Amino acid sequence: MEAVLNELVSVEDLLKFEKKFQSEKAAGSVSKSTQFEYAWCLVRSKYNDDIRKGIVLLEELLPKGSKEEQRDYVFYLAVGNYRLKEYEKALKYVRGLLQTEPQNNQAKELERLIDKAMKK
Amino acid sequence: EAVLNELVSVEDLLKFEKKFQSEKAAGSVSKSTQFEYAWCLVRSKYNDDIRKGIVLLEELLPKGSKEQRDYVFYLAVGNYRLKEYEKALKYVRGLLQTEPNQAKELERLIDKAMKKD
Amino acid sequence: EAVLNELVSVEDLLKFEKKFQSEKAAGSVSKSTQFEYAWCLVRSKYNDDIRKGIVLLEELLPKGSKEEQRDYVFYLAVGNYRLKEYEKALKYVRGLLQTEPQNNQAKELERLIDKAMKK
Amino acid sequence: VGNAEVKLEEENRSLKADLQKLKDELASTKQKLEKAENQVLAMRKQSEGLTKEYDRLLEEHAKLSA
Amino acid sequence: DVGNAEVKLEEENRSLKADLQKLKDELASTKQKLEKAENQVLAMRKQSEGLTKEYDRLLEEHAKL
Amino acid sequence: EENRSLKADLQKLKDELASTKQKLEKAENQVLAMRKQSEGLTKEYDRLLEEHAKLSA
Amino acid sequence: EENRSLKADLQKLKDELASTKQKLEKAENQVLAMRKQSEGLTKEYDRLLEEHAKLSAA
Numbered sequence: 001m002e003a004v005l006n007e008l009v010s011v012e013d014l015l016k017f018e019k020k021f022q023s024e025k026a027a028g029s030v031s032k033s034t035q036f037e038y039a040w041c042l043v044r045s046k047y048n049d050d051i052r053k054g055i056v057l058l059e060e061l062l063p064k065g066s067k068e069e070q071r072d073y074v075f076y077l078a079v080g081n082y083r084l085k086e087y088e089k090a091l092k093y094v095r096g097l098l099q100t101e102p103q104n105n106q107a108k109e110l111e112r113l114i115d116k117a118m119k120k
Numbered sequence: 121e122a123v124l125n126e127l128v129s130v131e132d133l134l135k136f137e138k139k140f141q142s143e144k145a146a147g148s149v150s151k152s153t154q155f156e157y158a159w160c161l162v163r164s165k166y167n168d169d170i171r172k173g174i175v176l177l178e179e180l181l182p183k184g185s186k187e188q189r190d191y192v193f194y195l196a197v198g199n200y201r202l203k204e205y206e207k208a209l210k211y212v213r214g215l216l217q218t219e220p221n222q223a224k225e226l227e228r229l230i231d232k233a234m235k236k237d
Numbered sequence: 238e239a240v241l242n243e244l245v246s247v248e249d250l251l252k253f254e255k256k257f258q259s260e261k262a263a264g265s266v267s268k269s270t271q272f273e274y275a276w277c278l279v280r281s282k283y284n285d286d287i288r289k290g291i292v293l294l295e296e297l298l299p300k301g302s303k304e305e306q307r308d309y310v311f312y313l314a315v316g317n318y319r320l321k322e323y324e325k326a327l328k329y330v331r332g333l334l335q336t337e338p339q340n341n342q343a344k345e346l347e348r349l350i351d352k353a354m355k356k
Numbered sequence: 357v358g359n360a361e362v363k364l365e366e367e368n369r370s371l372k373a374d375l376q377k378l379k380d381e382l383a384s385t386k387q388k389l390e391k392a393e394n395q396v397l398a399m400r401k402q403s404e405g406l407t408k409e410y411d412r413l414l415e416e417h418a419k420l421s422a
Numbered sequence: 423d424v425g426n427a428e429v430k431l432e433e434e435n436r437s438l439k440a441d442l443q444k445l446k447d448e449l450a451s452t453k454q455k456l457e458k459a460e461n462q463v464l465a466m467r468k469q470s471e472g473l474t475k476e477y478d479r480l481l482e483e484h485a486k487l
Numbered sequence: 488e489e490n491r492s493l494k495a496d497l498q499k500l501k502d503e504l505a506s507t508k509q510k511l512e513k514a515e516n517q518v519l520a521m522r523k524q525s526e527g528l529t530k531e532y533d534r535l536l537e538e539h540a541k542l543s544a
Numbered sequence: 545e546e547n548r549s550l551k552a553d554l555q556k557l558k559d560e561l562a563s564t565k566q567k568l569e570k571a572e573n574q575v576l577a578m579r580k581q582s583e584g585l586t587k588e589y590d591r592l593l594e595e596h597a598k599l600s601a602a
């Protein structure tokens with residue numbers, strides 16, 4: 001199943017990106033792209049602690065981001081909060097991102113998913 | 121095809137929003153571009169999109185060249201899609217009085233949807 | 238619902254044709270009106286309409302700006318796909334995808350053209 | 357002294373001739389420049405005509421490709 | 423008259439000496455205050471560096487909950 | 488001294504002639520660019536001619 | 545006249561004192577901005593405190 005390939009590639013990504021992140025943290029500052037790579041692997045992982053670590057890394061990178069970079073960070077924060085079923089924070093990030101980009105179809109479908117899950 | 125319709129709808133929404141913002145950054149927004157944006161918006165499947173389209177159409181309504189008939193028609197459509205049937209009927213009646221020959225089936229639909237509830 | 242879709246398609250074709258002729262009679266036709274008209278022609282169910290819309294889009298190609306020519310090429314691909322002119326549809330969509338490699342809408346359009354070509 | 361006046365009048369008539377030649381060359385250059393401007397004007401006219409030509413040629417090519 | 427003029431000379435003279443002394447004292451006070459203001463600002467930037475990590479840990483705990 | 492006024496006028500004339508020479512050379516470069524453009528139009532028109540001949544056969 | 549030297553040095557002293565007055569004005573502007581940011585920190589912290597206490601009161 002595609003799920004087996006996905007899980008094995010997830011394990012490889014997690015290992016190698018954690019290695020790069022830790023190598024950069026041990027020797028001086030960690031670059032923004034490496035921290036983003038790590039958080040991006042983390043929020044797509046199947047472990048919820050991994051998604052939490054990715055959300056933390058994205059929130060830490062958020063203030064020292066550029067223009068497009070903070071929009072990407074907010075998109076992935078919405079994704080991560082959606083996956084942890086923290087639908088309000090997901091809705092906050094996706095509504096902010098859609099306020100700065102009204103017709104990003106991906107963030108519109110993401111907010112659609114969050115709203116569909118919020119109705120209980 | 122539903123896929124073709126969805127893809128062209130997303131492209132229209134994206135690119136006309138981009139044109140709207142590009143023209144808004146540098147001075148006034150053109151009437152034709154804002155109409156295109158609002159009309160794509162009222163044809164969208166997201167309710168917020170129809171709300172934005174109705175707002176833009178109403179803001180094109182005052183200083184129009186009589187095309188106010190199209191603006192009122194699309195306002196009726198947008199209000200109908202949001203289940204705001206009254207304004208749909210009001211705009212469709214205004215347009216029908218200005219034209220003795222479209223929107224009659226729109227009136228039919230508004231009335232049947234008011235009868236359904 | 239579908240009835241509403243049909244009624245707005247009919248209103249669009251009629252009134253945009255009317256405005257096209259109104260601007261054609263008195264001097265130059267605006268590019269926005271011609272684009273609206275072709276936008277409607279390529280959505281009609283008559284193949285002659287899609288042919289006319291493709292003609293208007295090709296006429297509008299040199300007059301468009303950087304982003305307008307991309308939209309024109311997108312709709313040329315759409316119109317040729319709908320007329321089963323898969324060669325020209327593929328050509329325009331690949332031209333467009335060279336300047337925007339990850340426009341997912343044009344990727345799904347090319348995929349529709351390819352699946353119809355292999356069938 | 358008389359030699360000096362003779363030389364003076366020599367340089368004098370030479371100066372008159374050189375001034376005449378400069379005036380003539382100026383007139384000729386000016387006429388040539390203005391006719392060049394007329395040429396350029398006609399060319400811009402034909403450029404706009406070429407725009408119309410391209411409009412019609414493109415319309416025919418599109419109607420034939422369809 | 424000489425007498426009055428030399429008296430006035432020394433009067434202006436001692437007055438100038440006093441004004442210069444006062445100017446020097448006020449200069450010393452202002453410089454000292456500026457210097458310790460710089461000291462405060464340095465400590466404050468240090469506490470800003472600390473506040474960054476404080477916010478990081480706050481985020482990590484909020485996420486853990 | 489009329490000769491001094493003459494020589495001042497002549498120095499001004501030399502300056503203005505230098506300036507007209509530079510403007511002439513620059514107009515020449517602009518016309519050369521327009522000629523490059525006309526040649527480009529010519530070649531593209533020949534290609535379109537071949538295309539039209541293909542469409543006619 | 546070395547009294548004129550005193551007068552010229554005092555003119556320079558007045559110039560530099562105007563510069564120092566503008567110095568303190570500008571430094572006060574910067575400190576005021578720092579104050580505004582500190583107060584924003586405090587208010588945001590208070591809102592976070594309310595949220596944390598609400599989570600605790602569960």
